[PDB]
């Protein structure tokens, strides 16, 4: 029993973190096999970030200009290329701590763990959701660029995020491991619109199922609703519209608790319209949306 | 910017987790040097747990009855002893992944990360506070016994908790790594009173300082208070009394923000008496108490 915002064990990722320095700038790199991945803005100075021409800035750089250090050992850079907003530094040594890995571009609403790093050293691990607006609400200071997000299936690490930028609103933006930004963001010091964000409805419902499994059942009621009726309430409260695909994904949780998905929707509708009346659910006084149905099943069954 | 409930990187602890089996029961062990540590209830069957005589149950056991497996390798047990509520299994091989470590008995109100494990394999990592009543609100299922709590200073892991029991109320109890339970708990299947819990006042204030540092300042007011006036409010709302030692510990945060500790106390007093009026602080609709002043400094400065 109990339900916590749990991150994956970070060990396999800690063994991949390196420090990358280019001129005056130092940030984090991810060392997988014989390639070190890092944000391309490592080649910029403060005068460049306003509107950098990354192609021209990278032309003034040679393999010997990129300093890569893994703990105390210096890696030898034998190749360098830019792929979208990431730099790929070929080194002469494969990382002996390279786990089984994949690069994946996650969907908005999905979750992942972040290993925050500074100077190539890990400081902490936390669980994040990729917001429907493609930002993440993380915890990152200057020096954290290059820190990554990931999921773990058995022994395989699926890297899904690389931290690049803090927006003027304090929210975070970054790329997949091919260097493609999530959302409309660009890697330059300009005011950037993070669109309207919505609450991940299927995740709130998954968390309500976690609450029932763990004993928090005060919010269950004698009501039901329909997808169209529920979605009229979701639009009013800026919640993502619920689809039959979402209902299908909540099937295991509906089977486990014996509570039909539309009956849980009616509980959510009443919570949206009336609030919590000063009560809490799983230690929270607000509707939590950063747990997927998969996360709830995983945490409630004990998958390692 | 941003503030998250962050756990320490779990890597150094993952390399210590083993599976311990005694007869029918399997739980987690912590392998440090040539000793494997685990809850002593591994020697019990379901008939024993109601009122076990651990001394007599351990007498029916030999070194060969304790099966220890680290990943796929079997460890050879050459000694066994009981220390309070923990068993210490001497093995013939020192763990080559043993980090620099210490055993510490943490104080109530202090925080630590938990690496939840099943069959010797890690499933997730989360940050916990030792409640003033010596329970922890974690996330543990059957099989998680032997999972540990820890803090990390530079390269040294300070192990502070070993999970033993879920109380009928769904909260968690365990021991330090010498086998002494935190609180009045005993390792037997009996109804056990977890005393009245209070909110960790110094931690709520630390979190209010984190909120100001990160831009959430709506709760700041034109008022002040005194330790005695504030403590009249803390007693009414079952908050731990604030002492000058707590004020001293909040000194770095007071120096950084320029907000005197008693002025922050007056904000807390008004939040306690009026609620949040439907607003949030650092993404929360309730006063968060599981961040110490140290955690706030660490997260806000970037300690790795
Ligand atoms: C300070 C900080 C805090 C938290 N997360 C990231 C940063 N860094 C940044 O946002 C900036 C930057 C500015 C503009 C565009 C981009 Cl891609 C990056 N770097 C270059 C220092
Ligand atoms: C099921 C479970 C879920 C979460 N955390 C722990 C447990 N296990 C327990 O609480 C029990 C037990 C019962 C009584 C006393 C003690 Cl010390 C232990 N074990 C033996 C299964």
From Swiss-Prot, chains A, B:
There is a cross-link at residues 5, 90 (Glycyl lysine isopeptide (Lys-Gly) (interchain with G-Cter in ubiquitin)). It catalyses: TSAVLQ-|-SGFRK-NH2 and SGVTFQ-|-GKFKK the two peptides corresponding to the two self-cleavage sites of the SARS 3C-like proteinase are the two most reactive peptide substrates. The enzyme exhibits a strong preference for substrates containing Gln at P1 position and Leu at P2 position. It is found in: Host cytoplasm; Host Golgi apparatus; Host nucleus. Residues 1-304 form the Peptidase C30 domain. Changing residue 205 to V: In strain: Zeta/P.2. Changing residue 142 to A: Does not affect ability to cleave and inactivate human TRMT1. Inhibited by pyridone-containing alpha-ketoamides compounds 13a and 13b. In turn, alpha-ketoamide 13b (tert-butyl (1-((S)-1-(((S)-4-(benzylamino)-3,4-dioxo-1-((S)-2-oxopyrrolidin-3-yl)butan-2-yl)amino)-3-cyclopropyl-1-oxopropan-2-yl)-2-oxo-1,2-dihydropyridin-3-yl)carbamate) inhibits SARS-CoV-2 replication in human lung cells. Inhibited ex vivo by michael acceptor inhibitor N3. Inhibited ex vivo by compound 11a and 11b. Changing residue 49 to A: Does not affect ability to cleave and inactivate human TRMT1. Residues 1-304 are cytoplasmic. The active site is at residues 41, 145. Cleaves the C-terminus of replicase polyprotein at 11 sites. Recognizes substrates containing the core sequence [ILMVF]-Q-|-[SGACN]. Cleaves and inactivates human TRMT1, preventing tRNA guanine(26)-dimethylation of tRNAs. May cleave human NLRP1 in lung epithelial cells, thereby activating the NLRP1 inflammasome pathway. May cleave human GSDMD, triggering alternative GSDME-mediated epithelial cell death upon activation of the NLRP1 inflammasome, which may enhance the release interleukins 1B, 6, 16 and 18. Also able to bind an ADP-ribose-1''-phosphate (ADRP). 3CL-PRO exists as monomer and homodimer. Only the homodimer shows catalytic activity. Interacts with host FBXO22; this interaction promotes the proteasomal degradation of nsp5. This is 3C-like proteinase nsp5. It comes from Severe acute respiratory syndrome coronavirus 2. The chain holds residues 3264 to 3567 of 7096 of the full protein.
């Amino acid at each position: 029993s109990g339900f916590r915002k749990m991150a994956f064990p970070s060990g396999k990722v800690e063994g991949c973190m390196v420090q990358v320095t280019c001129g005056t700038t130092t940030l984090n790199g991810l060392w997988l096999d014989d390639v070190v991945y890092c944000p391309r803005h490592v080649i910029c100075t403060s005068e460049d970030m306003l509107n950098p021409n990354y192609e021209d800035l990278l032309i003034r750089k040679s393999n010997h200009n990129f300093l890569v250090q893994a703990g105390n050992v210096q890696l030898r850079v034998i190749g360098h290329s830019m792929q979208n907003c990431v730099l790929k530094l070929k080194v002469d040594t494969a990382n002996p701590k390279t786990p089984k890995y994949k690069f994946v571009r996650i969907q908005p609403g999905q979750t992942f763990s972040v290993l925050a790093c500074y100077n190539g050293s890990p400081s902490g691990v936390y669980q994040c959701a990729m917001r429907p607006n493609f930002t993440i609400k993380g915890s990152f200071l200057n020096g954290s660029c290059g820190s990554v997000g990931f999921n773990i299936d058995y022994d395989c690490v699926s890297f899904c995020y690389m931290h690049h930028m803090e927006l003027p609103t304090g929210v975070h933006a970054g790329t997949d491991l091919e260097g493609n930004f999530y959302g409309p963001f660009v890697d330059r010091q300009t005011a950037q619109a993070a669109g309207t964000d919505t609450t991940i409805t299927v995740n709130v419902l998954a968390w309500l199922y976690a609450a029932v499994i763990n004993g928090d059942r005060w919010f269950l009621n004698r009501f039901t609703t329909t997808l169209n009726d529920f979605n009229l309430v979701a639009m009013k409260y800026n919640y993502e519209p619920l689809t039959q695909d979402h209902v299908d994904i909540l099937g295991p949780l509906s089977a486990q608790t014996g509570i039909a998905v539309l009956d849980m929707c009616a509980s959510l509708k009443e919570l949206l319209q009336n609030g919590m009346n000063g009560r809490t659910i799983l230690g929270s006084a607000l509707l939590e949306d950063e747990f997927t149905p998969f996360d709830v099943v995983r945490q409630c069954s004990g998958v390692t």
